[PDB]
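Quick one, probably user error.
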């Protein structure tokens, strides 16, 4: 029987036993009888009718109409008539890109955004800073451009890699995303992930090293900013003010994953600061660091987000954290509920799209394989009902880019698993099935070829070649 191939699967589809050979939009109304994020699309032999509860629902309805037009373009016999009534399961449906590890030019970001909007993603998270590069310009700190935005090579390849966005480019990105229903979330990791910052501004750190260079390999850095130094707090105030100007979401992801604190332990300034504050250890110092940063953000009307660490203690009720450790999803759901935290599911078992998608593709000596079928197994609530897991805001898939040097590589690992993530964030469990998703994705190969000039076919051997190992 003839059906639609819309991804994500709509919450309700009622097909009729007639065929439509045109999708001309005959009516387009806003009505109070639909939620602001909801739409109803009626496909008739004469054309389509769209009703929506608000601008957001209208964006989604037009995205569904776009997919139906692609299907009809491939089906000259027509597509079924029917009524689609639709609204998302979760309000947060996100992808993260990592320009700190490999810079993503503006044009390439635009293509990435168009593709994620096709699948009704509504959050774009930018990992802007890390050991391997710093991509956010900050007035008054020119060495961020001249030093921190450049590295000499990647993994011994002898090829320099550099880049930094302009403020104007980032405001363009924000407007481009907004027009496509997407909010943009910056991430500035602190106090660690800061080898590039140290290369530019060694005076911000407990043990300044003028010979420090921007990192060209993966691994953990012990270089933490020294919370006793006034230049650090002036710098981060400047950072947060730039983010306030550029990013209207007002959300600032601070990282927050466990950092090595050996250098704080040894720092003569931090040692005496801990003694004055009767702090027992460097974890108490970390709690104080994040309380101070959260206060700076609050003075700005901004709110922090974190990669969840169950035993961190740096969170205040109402904040939002990301669940990411394998095997910890259900525990994190329970713990955040008890702690009054909101939770975004980014479990690396399902959502870390830097991992290879077919067994035998490059795993860089450590990555597990996450197939499309495994990815589609994701239920963000892990079996818990809406009344017990209402603090779960949605789903988020990071495409970490240590080993993804350009858009071609990035999209190879992001898609088609991002389509599965989109359906996990949008579609109620009652309309989800691997067999239906697999059928639709088969059709989407042609849809994406025609609309984006991009090939989503995946075989063990057709990943683009790498220069490393
Ligand atoms: Zn220190």
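Nope, works fine. Designed sequence:
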């Amino acid at each position: 029987t003839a059906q639609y191939s819309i991804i994500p699967e709509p919450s309700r589809t009622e097909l009729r036993q007639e065929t439509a050979k045109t999708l001309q939009l005959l009516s387009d109304q806003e009505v109070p009888t639909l939620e602001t994020d909801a739409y109803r699309l009626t496909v008739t032999p004469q054309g389509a009718h769209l009703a929506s509860g608000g601008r957001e629902g209208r964006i989604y309805g037009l995205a569904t109409l776009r997919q139906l037009r692609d299907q009809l373009a491939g089906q000259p016999e027509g597509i079924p008539c029917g009524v689609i009534t639709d609204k998302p399961r979760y309000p947060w449906r996100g992808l993260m890109v990592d320009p700190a590890r490999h810079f993503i030019p503006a044009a390439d970001l635009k293509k990435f955004v168009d593709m994620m909007a096709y699948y009704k993603f509504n959050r774009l998270h930018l990992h802007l800073t890390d050991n391997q590069g710093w991509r956010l310009p900050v007035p008054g700190y020119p060495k961020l451009k001249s030093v921190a935005s450049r590295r000499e090579e990647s993994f011994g390849d002898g090829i320099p890699h550099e880049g930094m966005y302009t403020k104007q480019e980032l405001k363009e990105l924000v407007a481009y995303c907004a027009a496509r229903g997407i909010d943009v979330i910056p991430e500035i990791d602190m106090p660690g992930h800061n080898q590039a910052l140290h290369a530019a501004y060694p005076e911000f750190f407990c043990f300044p090293k003028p010979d420090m260079n921007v990192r060209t390999t993966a691994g953990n850095s012990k270089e933490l900013v020294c919370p006793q130094k006034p230049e650090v707090w002036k710098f981060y105030a400047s950072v947060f003010n730039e983010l306030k100007d550029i990013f209207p979401s007002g959300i600032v992801h601070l990282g927050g994953d466990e950092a090595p604190t050996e250098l704080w332990e040894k720092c003569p300034l931090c040692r005496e600061a801990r003694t004055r504050a009767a702090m027992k250890d460097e974890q108490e110092q970390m709690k104080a660091f994040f309380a101070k940063t959260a206060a700076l953000l609050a003075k700005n009307g901004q709110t922090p987000q974190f990669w969840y660490e169950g035993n961190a203690g740096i969170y205040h009720p109402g904040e939002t954290v990301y669940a990411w450790r394998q095997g910890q999803a259900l525990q994190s759901i329970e713990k955040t509920k008890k702690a009054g935290l909101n939770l975004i599911m980014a479990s690396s078992e399902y959502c870390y799209l830097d991992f290879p998608q077919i067994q035998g593709q490059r795993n860089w000596g450590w990555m597990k394989t996450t197939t499309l079928q495994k990815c589609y197994d994701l239920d963000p609530a892990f079996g818990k009902p809406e009344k017990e897991a209402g603090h779960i805001r949605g789903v988020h898939a990071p495409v970490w880019a240590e080993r993804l040097p350009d858009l071609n590589h990035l999209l190879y690992r992001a898609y088609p698993r991002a389509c599965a993530i989109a359906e996990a964030g949008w579609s109620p469990m009652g309309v989800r099935s691997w067999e239906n998703f697999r059928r639709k994705l088969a059709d989407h190969r042609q849809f994406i070829l025609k609309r984006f000039n991009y090939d989503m076919e995946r075989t063990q051997g057709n990943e683009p070649a790498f220069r490393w190992e």
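Residues 353 and 413 are 6 Å apart (CA to CA).
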